[PDB]
Every structure is written in structure tokens, then in C-alpha cells.
Amino acid sequence: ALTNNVAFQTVKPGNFNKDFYDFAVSKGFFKEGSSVELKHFFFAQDGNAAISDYDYYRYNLPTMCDIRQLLFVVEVVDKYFDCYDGGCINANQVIVNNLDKSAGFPFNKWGKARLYYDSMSYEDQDALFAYTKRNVIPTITQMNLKYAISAKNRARTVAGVSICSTMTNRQFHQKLLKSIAATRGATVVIGTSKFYGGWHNMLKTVYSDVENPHLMGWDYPKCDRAMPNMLRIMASLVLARKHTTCCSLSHRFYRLANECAQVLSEMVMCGGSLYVKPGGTSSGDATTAYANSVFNICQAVTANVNALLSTDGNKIADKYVRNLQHRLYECLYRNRDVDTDFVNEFYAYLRKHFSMMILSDDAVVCFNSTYASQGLVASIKNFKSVLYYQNNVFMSEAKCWTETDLTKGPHEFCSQHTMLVKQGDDYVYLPYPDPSRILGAGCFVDDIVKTDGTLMIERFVSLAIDAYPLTKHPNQEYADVFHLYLQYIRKLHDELTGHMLDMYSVMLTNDNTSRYWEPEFYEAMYTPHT
Amino acid sequence: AVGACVLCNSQTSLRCGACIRRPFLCCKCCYDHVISTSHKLVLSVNPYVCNAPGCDVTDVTQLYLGGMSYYCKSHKPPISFPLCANGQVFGLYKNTCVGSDNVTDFNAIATCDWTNAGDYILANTCTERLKLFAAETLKATEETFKLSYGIATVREVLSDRELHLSWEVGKPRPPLNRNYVFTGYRVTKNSKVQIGEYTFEKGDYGDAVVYRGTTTYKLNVGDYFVLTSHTVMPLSAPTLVPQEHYVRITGLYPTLNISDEFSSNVANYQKVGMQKYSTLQGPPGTGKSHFAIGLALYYPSARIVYTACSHAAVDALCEKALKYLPIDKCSRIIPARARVECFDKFKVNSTLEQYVFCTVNALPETTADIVVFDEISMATNYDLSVVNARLRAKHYVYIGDPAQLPAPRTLLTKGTLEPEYFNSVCRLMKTIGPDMFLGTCRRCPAEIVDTVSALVYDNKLKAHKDKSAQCFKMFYKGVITHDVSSAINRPQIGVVREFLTRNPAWRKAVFISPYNSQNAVASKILGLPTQTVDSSQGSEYDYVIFTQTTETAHSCNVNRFNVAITRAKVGILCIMSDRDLYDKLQFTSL
Amino acid sequence: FSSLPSYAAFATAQEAYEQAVANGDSEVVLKKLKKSLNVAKSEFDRDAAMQRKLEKMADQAMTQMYKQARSEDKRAKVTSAMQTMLFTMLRKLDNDALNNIINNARDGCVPLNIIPLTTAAKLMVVIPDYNTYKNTCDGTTFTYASALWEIQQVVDADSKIVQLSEISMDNSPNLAWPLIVTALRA
Amino acid sequence: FSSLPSYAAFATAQEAYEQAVANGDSEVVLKKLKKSLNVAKSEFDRDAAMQRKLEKMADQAMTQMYKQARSEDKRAKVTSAMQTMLFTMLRKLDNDALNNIINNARDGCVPLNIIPLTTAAKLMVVIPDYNTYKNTCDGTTFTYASALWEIQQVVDADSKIVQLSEISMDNSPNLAWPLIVTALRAN
Amino acid sequence: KMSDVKCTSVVLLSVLQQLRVESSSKLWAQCVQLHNDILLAKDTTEAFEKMVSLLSVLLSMQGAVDINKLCE
RNA sequence: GCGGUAGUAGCAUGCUAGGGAGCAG
RNA sequence: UGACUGCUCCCUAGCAUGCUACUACCG
Ligand SMILES: [Zn+2]
Ligand SMILES: [Zn+2]
Ligand SMILES: [Zn+2]
């Protein structure tokens, strides 16, 4: 413990935004039986919120994951990452955004990262870095309660990490992390806008000629508590693989050690006291969304490997594929060392019959249908089996959609539905969002961030630019929600200049704005060009 | 925040920080101020200063709009732009604010310091908004004045109740009563925590100071206190409300056919419901508080409050209520820390009375029915605003006679105040008269009203009593040791001590004389009932041993003598001071 | 900004050059005045440009300031805003159960703990006079929150279990009226 | 930008120009005039040019220098506060019992999870229920981690002191429930 | 309709918050429960139930002088 | 009569840094 | 008491270029 009395947390309600809502009903909304109706809200949480949540790590077990097939699908996954580059850098090359966030504990008794990124030379930071390549630095961590709109009354936590970790893991990974972030047209798609028809391009990629195509997604039940450790180490290793020159050996090994002490299983200053974090990842360090994606690919592959071998032997028709499977087993158990010929062969086989697009822990796979029925590509039931025997949770089948027509696109990826509609002359995919989200984000806020939009507006802009695609929808009330947001923004602005002309007659001398309360400024958005 | 131009009414967004009140000024009026007097500091949603790191400027003249901040001359980036501009100052309401031309008295109050009878008469004859403003900057001057003083530390603690103290190097030691309260610290370099409230009084002999402490901290030799103080707050209520008619008295039910000791009153009483508020001019103790009693009961059951300026005044008034009004519907309220112990015969401090009684010093801000104020001619316009705010009702009775002394105004030192200029309703009565009248007493002798009739009042004041010849003088002098702002007599009061054997009816007088510590030592003298001249007033008791000690103006004022003599039911002792005045009152001496 | 010295000179020079090229004259005087016109223009326009610039800077800072000021002060009156919003919202919602309790609470009766819902779970009412007692309490039954409570006690201010129709309006001044009644749900 | 020698030269070039222009003479007079004025213009251009650059750059230098200064100064403040917190943490631990436990080491290395357990004193305990109360910290004392402990005060959620009496089985449903027992290293 | 019920509830719990009710515990518990529930309601009835079974919480307080606000 | 240079003001493009806000994981 | 990323809109400041006219300069 530390204090002499524990601290209790609470999460206030959200606050209302009456007017906009009064507007909304005045336009004939929420008239009963509507197909749009509030559904996201600011849920409130009582006293013992944190620890009554951090308890969930008891969902995390030890595990032994089979060693041979792991020592192989790490190689295939590796092959998925041969188009980037990274290595150690130097102080004057890291790049921080919003260098003003928290700084974990106890450094948060003294100010944000302005100080520590400021009160240190570059040589300071380089001593630090090229120090931890030979030592260990156990750290702490804080747990924070998020306060933002939702749809399920549970808690939320985010692990604010202490500065001496990020301040190195950056230096050690930045080159790669960029190289991934800024490449167009591949598997991992972290960082590719959905504006200006980049979304449509994402799809017309992840199609790419697989013969009999069906679409399937899935989702991971409690993704970041239950991930066993072995897979976390596997992620960190596949990332460090490209460090073959900057580093050495013992440099790496201590660097891995410093990471596994700083994010995997170190103490957790939850509340006013210290615990231990037995395992599982931690959604706040320097290398998440990437590591989550990698792990995810590891699951998808392992599922396919099982789906292959599990199949009988003497019903496979394509003598080529039978000789594949056979060769596969041989390389997997009998052999000892890699068959680069075979590995390249496999990777190609997958790209041909099981293409996949990945965001950090959020997938879509387009796959060769009749194969599935023949079991040479991991249809869902294999996902049940893997999540079981090596994530030891149970992925219900009420969450993994599946799609046979490919026109009207997938079902939901990164929480947008995908309509296919006619732009100009041709046909493109616009992603549009669950309307209730847009509304129930209009009416509930923190305080001044709304309570009174007349100061703000800029929000209402961004919201409308985000709920434009709903103008194309064949349902009705949907398209309305756009025309609402419009006539709103307009009237709002009108009263603003009214006041600045009324109290203080200082009439504002020109317009320009009128592009806002007219749709053309938006739709230009979803259209390829600049 | 925002508001209106405290003078030009214009809604604005400035505060002349150079002021001590920092009020809301229109752009134009602010311009005129910052051009006129010395006040050169302007605040809005930030201050207007030389936001250069090193540069510091008071006025906003050489202040230039730089980028988005401000600068003096020396940092004016060439995208500059002066703030002070062509007879306006940039702020808000750029084009709305309408200036006003009482720049005159605006400067006159913003610059002065109540040194002047002129400063007062303007302050009590300026505009209403400026009237309250003058009022609060008056209290502000008062508070700064009180702040200017010094500190008291200990030489040694003689007793747990008796202490031996001193002050710092020279800093002025105030007078002595209970109106001087302190709070100390046992500072072990640190450990400087409040050690509680302590008031201080004269020891019984020599260098001694009797301290009453609220805490139980045993004081030692390395100990000290600070004279503790409040902080006055702004107000907003007008000093006066609109007087209007009705058709009659509607919505209430009076006392049909009341009585005879209240007979000469019901006409007046009904006049209550005709004028929106009412008042009474009358001679000192003239059925006056009696009249108020008969009126408040003239409506038998109502949310009534009896209240006045001082302690003993409202005390005797509420004993008067008691004496007439049924005590069962009566509650006398007193203050909290309440180091004063008073007539407390009802349910004390019991808030929800129907006939509530409390002094202004913390009149609980409530609504009521016809409330009366008593001794209007005492307090300041500030107070009248304060009570107007705290209170809500139907009819507001303000009784007084500015021939009765008013506030101490211990800042008012040179160039006294003149009658109506005491406060607003003083202007009312001195001009528009009272709202009712009755003009004779039941309460004081005839020779004594002959005394008071050639001095303060006119001979036109004629009471209803007789000469009982229980009024005698003297002119003898001797010791005047004096202490701090309250000088005493020893041989005059000792001749009084042997004189306590002279005439029987004088073993229950009241020791009165124009000094505080004088009457305080008077308890050490013979254990004689006493009263400082102010602690009397309006009342009427039988005998008063007046020992006019010193011969300063505060000691020989005609009005302080008059309020000493307007309270004698039966007679006066007064061993006089000014042979001119000593013969102005007409008795035998010895 | 059609009101500046350079504007005046511009106008004069324009007038002269227009008169000339209207009167017809030498190619050479054309060049004189045309240079002159160029001068007047290419300074007047500059002053007017920078002027409207400064004008706009002023307007922008002013409107930002207004934003900020009204913002903060609203942040300061959050409380009273909230409550008045609530009550208008409630009588807007209009429910005779809600109205029931609300009117009653303004009347005098207020409960002394969360009003529960089950058949069990007594509640405590505070009724402040006989008449206030007489309007709900009619026999041992009890309408409040449009719910039927049966009584199981009565007690005046100083905690004396005083019986049911023991008190009576006539003999009511026999009783401290801060009655602290209890009851249970139908 | 007036105290410039070029300003003297351009100013006198004018002086002569209005001298021979008010006394307007010949095309050569006009020629000398226009020539001088064109070239003294030329002197003014660069002076009134580069000088702007010098000035603006001076100013930005002053800015950045202030900034560097403030940075280092706050570095000083942080180092101070850091060490002082460190030492106020330190001088509360050097119990002999530790020095014992570290001598007893095989090497001078002990895993951390058995230092606060064995050597530390004042114990806090959280409790969610009455049952767990009466099963684990019932009575006035108890052993745990193989050592005795004494109850001091039993505060609750609102930090209201609660005697060891009120905690009946049935006074329980009247309590904020996660009571904090502050026991002590009994010895 | 009911949608306004959910809204009113949000306003309301915000009020009870700022009245410093969270110094209690068990209060804040029962309240946050009623809130978190109606914000998942389904039929106006049991809503109105939890609504009043909350509101009275506030009524039992004495920070509000509702005899004022019912000025209309 | 034509080139280059020199300033000016205008217009564009981009890049920088600086704040304000929105979304997905 | 507020984590690591990624995509966007609006408003400044600097910069470069780039465009255009004016004016002066030399052929
Ligand atoms: Zn001033
Ligand atoms: Zn003004
Ligand atoms: Zn300066």
C-alpha cells in the first residue's frame, strides 16, 4: 500500500444539450416507432469501479502453445512482413505528437512530458537507450477510467504507462512503425484514410481475384486480457526481427527483457496500492495496434494450418494440394529447419486463396468458397477451435458475420457499414455510420464542449462531414439526419452573427461560410483527388 | 464577467483596475476616467499590460495591440495598433455603450478619500448607483484604514486570563473595549496555525491586558496575535424604494378599535397602508417605539420584525415589545459569537418567530410583513441598501429624528456631517418630512427639556412631565490619567462614590459620560450602573450619573450631552465640564 | 476605405487625366499624368490594403473575446441553470404520479428515504399538520405516489407512538404536528 | 530606420531636388535631380531592407533564448523535488529487521515480494463483506503470514470510525461495505 | 416519448451529483444503479417506476426550495 | 523601341511550426 | 485523476517558390 486510506473512483453522468434535442423533435424526430432512436449514452459508474474491473485478469491463464507448429507459423507470419524497414535511431529523429499527455507515476506529480522531454539533452536520452541494452528497469503503471460515450454499461480502463518506457521504445521502434504506417496497398492497413475514395481502394484490393469469394469477419472475446504471454513475446520478436544491424545479440535480448518487464507483467498502481499483472497485454504502450495486428494474423494462419491437416487424406483431389499437405506435415514435424522454398510456396498459396485485410485486432477475410466446404481454408468452426485451445476463451458464433454476395460489401469493419452507390458515373463504396451514434453524440457531452453550441459549431461541421454518406441511403429517416445537421448548422450560425450584430452591433463584414450550410462542400470529400 | 457601466449604465466589460472597487465602465466612460485622474489600469478578459516579458506599463495608452497580446511601446511589432483610440478604449460593446458626463463626480469619488465633509455631502448627494458605490468605497477606505494598524505580542502571560503585552515598533495601539479581537500563533518558525479568537481589555492595574480566548491555547512568552477582521462585500439594493399610493390598505386585517395608550396613533397607523413605506419624526422617547408597538399589533398577527442600529436600542425596544406585545409570539435574536449580553427574555435566536427582533449586524436576509427600522438617523446609506436587499415585505417603517446622533463615522474627523446628509431617509425627513408625527413625551423632566430646547432642539420642543428637581450639577476637576482613546475621571467619580451616600433615589442611576474606557473603569469605581453616551439614546431610564470628564468636543458636544439628558425618566446627575454649558443647565451643584 | 487622403489625391489625378484624354492632347502629357496616376494609385491602394487588414485583425480579436467571455460565465452559473432546466422538463413530462409527489412535496409531506417499489419495504412520511394528515390518511389506508400504503405506526415530534384516531382535529393542538408516519405497500 | 546615413543622403538629394525644382530649370537639372533621387532611393532600399531582417531575427533570438533558460530552470526544480521525495521515502525503512534479512541472503539478492511482507509493520486490510470479516479478521487480533497482528481502527467507505462492536451479522446491512481494518505488526 | 424520460434522467442525476450527494456511499450506489438502468429501458412503465423511486431521493434533500421553482 | 536588375502591392503553391475540435482501434 | 497510435476539418504565424502589376535601374 502507500497511503493510509484507499481512494474510490466515480464517473459522473454526461450532461444534456437540450436545445439541439428540442430542435430535433421540432423536425419531427423521435416520433414513436422511429427506426432511429437514441442508443449510445454516457453511462455512470459507482464507487469500486477500477478494482472491480482490473479483477478481470483472472480470465488470463498460463498456457503452453504447441512448440513445433509455433516455430513454423512464426516464420510464415514473418514472411508477411518483408516489405518494411527499421532499426535503432537517435534522439533527433523520434517524433512526438501532442507532447503534453500524462506521464504515469510518480512523474505526474510534476507535470506532463514537456519537462522530461525538455529537461534532458539528446545525450541524456542516448545514454538511457544505449544503457538499457544491457540492464533491466522494472516500472509501474497507472489505470485510468475512460469517460466517453458507449453502449454497454461496463467499465473501461486504459493503462497509462510511465515515461521511462515510451521514451525508449519509441527510439527503438520508430523507424519501422512509420514504415508500416505509411505504405499503401498491403495486408496491414493501419493508416489509410477512408476519405477521397481511399476506402473503395482498400476493398478493391482485398478482393483481388479469389475464385469463389465469400466474406467473413470475426471478433475477439475479451481480446487484451486473455491473450496468453507466449503470443505477446511472439509479437515482440517478429517486430524486432528487422533490427539485425543496429542491434547485436545481448543488446536485443536485454531489450526484449526490458519490454517484457515494462508491458507484460509488472506492477499496476491501480487505485492507491500495488498489485501484479499476471499476464495479458496492456493497451497503452508504444507498440500496440501493430502488435495486436500481428498476433491477429498469427491466429488466422494457425487456423488455416489446422484446417489443412485436420482434413482427411484420400479425398483431396488436386494431386498438387495433396502433395502440399503431405509436404507440409513433413516440414513441420519431421524436419528441423526451415524450407524457404516451402514457406514461400505456402505464403503464395494463401495469398491466392485466403486474402486478408487487418486493422489492429479487426479483420476481414475474402476466401475461396468451395475450398471452405472442402475444408482447405479455415472457415469459422476452426476459429472456434483455436480460440479455444490456445486462447482458452469461447468465441460465440453470434458475432462472426458471413457474406456470399460481394457487391454490397462486407457487413461492418471498423464500425462502418458499407453501401455501394453511384458517384458521377461509376460505382463506389462509401462507408456510413450507425445513425444512432451520430445523434446520440449530438445531444450528450461534457460541458462547454457542448451545453451551448453557439461557441462551437466546428463540432457540428465535423459531425456532418462524417454523416454525409447517409444521404444515399434508401431508407428515409437516415437521409434526414443529414438534412437536420445541415439546417441546424445554418440556423446556429445565423444567430451567432445576429448576436454579434445585436448586443455589440459589430456586424461581421462578409460571408464565405455559406459553403458550410450547403452540401457541396462535403460530398467533394468522398471523391478521389487531392 | 460583464455588466453595466456603473456610471454611464452602458453594458460593458471593463474594470478600472487602478481603482480599489474595479467597477464596470463603458468604453467611453472608461476612456474619460483613464484620461482624467490618476487611475491608469484597465482590465478585461485579461489585464491590459505590457505583455513583453520585462516591460511593465500601467496606463493602456502606450499599450499596443501586438499580434494577439499587448505590448508597451518598445515591443510594438510592426503589425501593431494602439489600444487607446480616438475617444474610446477597445474592449467590447464597441458601438453599444453610451457614455455619460458625470465624469465629474466619478473622478471626485474615485480620487478622494472621505477626508472631506464635501466628500460626504457629494457621496450622499451624488447618483444612486454612485451613492452605493461611494458607500462601498467608503467601507473600503475604512477597511484599509483598519488594516494600516499594527500587531500585538506578549511580554509575558500574567494569568490564564490576565496577560502582559506590547506591540511592535510604534504601530498605533487602538482603543480598548471588546471591538478589538485578535488571533495568535505559536510559531516554531513553522506551526503558524490560527490559535483562535481573542479579544483584549484593560487590566485592573498597570501593565495588564485581560484576554478572552475562544481556544484553549495556553499562551507563553514567544507569543503574538493579529487584529482579525472581516471583508466587506458589494451590494446592489437601492438606498431607497419607490413611494407609491394604493387605494387603501388591502389584503390585510388590522386591529379594530385598539386601545388608549395607542389611541393617538391609529390614524397614523392606517396611514401606514396608504403610503408604500412610512416614517415617524418625533421627540426623543415620545410614545415613539410605543407607537411602533401599537402599530405592529395594530395588525395583530403579521410577519413583523423590530430592528434598529445598535445593541441597547433594539434591546430596550424589544423589552418594550415584551412589555406590550405577548411574549409568546416574540423572539429576540442575538449574534453568534455574541460577546455582548443583552435583553434575551424571549425564545432567543429562535429564527422562525412571527415578531422577530435582530440588529443589522447580521439581520438574516428574509421576507416579512411591515417591518420597522428604528433610529434611521444613526446608520449610513450603505446600511439602508443592505437592509433593503436582505428584506422583502409590504411596508417599511423608518423612524428617526436626525437631532439624534448618528454613526460614529470615526473617519469623519474634520468638517462634520450635516443633518439630512447622514443618509437617504435623513434627506427624506429633513425634506419631505416624516410620514407621520406625534410631538410630546411622557418620559423626561421639564427643566431638562428647557435645557435641551435652547441647545439642539428649539424651544418648540415641549414634553409632558414636571420639574422634580432630581437634577444637579458640579464643576470640579482633578485627575485625568487617560489611556487609549477613552479618558477617565478618578476624583470626580470618587466624589460621586461618596455622593452615592448623599441622596437615596440615586443608588440605581446609570454612569454615563462621553467615553468608553471611562465607563469601563467606572465598574471598578463603585460597581455603578453605567452606559457610554452612545449606548444610551432613545431610551428612558430614571437616573443617570453623568460625569462629563474631559473637555474635548467629543466630551462636550451639545448632542452627546443632549442624548445623555433625553433619557432621564426622573432626573440627572451631571458634574459639569464647560462653565458656559455648566451654567447652561439650571440646577444646584455642591 | 473611400475616405482617406490618398483617396483624395487619387480622385484629383484621375479627374485631370480623364479631362485630358477627354480633351485630346499630346502623347507626352499623357505619359506625365499616367506616371502621376500610377503613383497616386500604387500608394493609395497600399494604404487601403493594410487598413482593411488591421480592420480585420480587430474584428477577429473582438469576436474571439466575446466567445471566451460568454463561455466562462456560463461555466459559472451551471447550478441554477441545471435546476430550472430540470423542473421545466418535469412539468413538461407531466405525470400525475410525478405531479402527485411533487405537489405534495411542495405542500409539506416529504419522504425520509428512497421511495421503494416492492410490496414490502415500508416508507416514512413526514406530515406537518392534521389537515395535511387528513387529505391522504383516510382510515388505515394511504394514497401516495399513487400507491396504496397501509399504516403501521404514528408518532409526533418528540417520538411518542401516538395512536391512530387518538389525535383528532379538535384535540390536534394536543399533538406536535411533525408527524413521522410509516406505512407499507399494497 | 531614420538614423541612417542613407537617410542623410536621400534627404539632401531631395533638398537639392526641391531646390532646383521649385526653381525648376532645364532638362539637365531635372536629370541630375531624378538621377540623384533614383540612386538615393537605391540606398534606402537595401538599408530599409536588410534592417528589417536584422530586427526580426534579433527578436526571434531573444524569444528562443528565454525559452532555453526557462527549460533549464525547471529542470533544476524537478531535480530538487525528486531527490527530496526520494529521501523522505528513504528514512522510514532502515529497520534492523531488514538489515538482518539481507545479511541472511545467499548473495545480497532477495526477491521483492517478501520484503514488505516480512519486514513491514502497519497492515491495512480491505474487506467486502461481513462474512469475510468474521472469517478472516474476527476477534481483536489474528495471525497471518505467520505473525500476529492487532486491530486498531476499522474505518469504512466514508471514513467513519466504526468500533469492533457494531459489526454484527445484522447491523451489517446498514454499513458502507468495503471496510478497512488498520491492524498492526503485533509483537 | 420515453426518450425524454431517458433525457430527464440524465439531467437529474447530474443535479444530484452536483448537490454533493456522493459524500455518502450507499446513496451513490442506489442512484448510479437507477441511472444505468433506465438508460437501458424498454417500456415507459417500469421507467416511470425507477424515475420516481429516484426523484424522491432528491426530494428528501433540503438543498432545493422547490416551493420557489414551482413558480411556473 | 527591346533585356536584365531593383523594389513594391497583388495572387497562387507548398512547407513549416502554433493552437481549437471530430472519428476509428 | 486522462495511455499509445492513425486519419481528417477550421483558424493563425513563418517560409519558399510561384504567379501578376507598379515604379527605378542598366542593354
Ligand atoms: Zn479608476
Ligand atoms: Zn461609462
Ligand atoms: Zn514593453
From Swiss-Prot, chain B:
Changing P77L: In strain: Delta/B.1.617.2. Residues 1-113 form the CV ZBD domain. It is found in: Host endoplasmic reticulum-Golgi intermediate compartment. Zn(2+) 11 binds at C5, C8, C26, C29. Residues 257-438 form the (+)RNA virus helicase ATP-binding domain. Zn(2+) 13 binds at C50, C55, C72, H75. Changing P419S: In strain: Mu/B.1.621. Residues 439-590 form the (+)RNA virus helicase C-terminal domain. LRR repeats lie at residues 228-248. It catalyses: ATP + H2O = ADP + phosphate + H(+). A ribonucleoside 5'-triphosphate binds at G282, P283, P284, G285, T286, G287, K288, S289. Changing R392C: In strain: Omicron/BA.2, Omicron/BA.2.12.1, Omicron/BA.2.75, Omicron/BA.4, Omicron/BA.5, Omicron/BQ.1.1, Omicron/XBB.1.5, Omicron/EG.5.1. Zn(2+) 12 binds at C16, C19, H33, H39. Interacts with nsp8 to form the replication-transcription complex (RTC): nsp12, nsp7, two subunits of nsp8, and up to two subunits of nsp13. Interacts with host TBK1; this interaction inhibits TBK1 phosphorylation and decreases by 75% IRF3 phosphorylation, which leads to reduced IFN-beta production. Plays a role in viral RNA synthesis. Multi-functional protein with a zinc-binding domain in N-terminus displaying RNA and DNA duplex-unwinding activities with 5' to 3' polarity. Activity of helicase is dependent on magnesium. Binds to host TBK1 and inhibits TBK1 phosphorylation; the interaction with TBK1 decreases IRF3 phosphorylation, which leads to reduced IFN-beta production. This is Helicase nsp13. The chain holds residues 5325 to 5914 of 7096 of the full protein.
From Swiss-Prot, chain E:
It is found in: Host cytoplasm, Host perinuclear region; Host cytoplasm; Host endoplasmic reticulum. Residues 1-72 form the RdRp Nsp7 cofactor domain. Interacts with nsp8 and nsp12 to form the replication-transcription complex (RTC): nsp12, nsp7, two subunits of nsp8, and up to two subunits of nsp13. Eight copies of nsp7 and eight copies of nsp8 assemble to form a heterohexadecamer dsRNA-encircling ring structure. Plays a role in viral RNA synthesis. Forms a hexadecamer with nsp8 (8 subunits of each) that may participate in viral replication by acting as a primase. Alternatively, may synthesize substantially longer products than oligonucleotide primers. This is Non-structural protein 7. It comes from Severe acute respiratory syndrome coronavirus 2 (2019-nCoV).
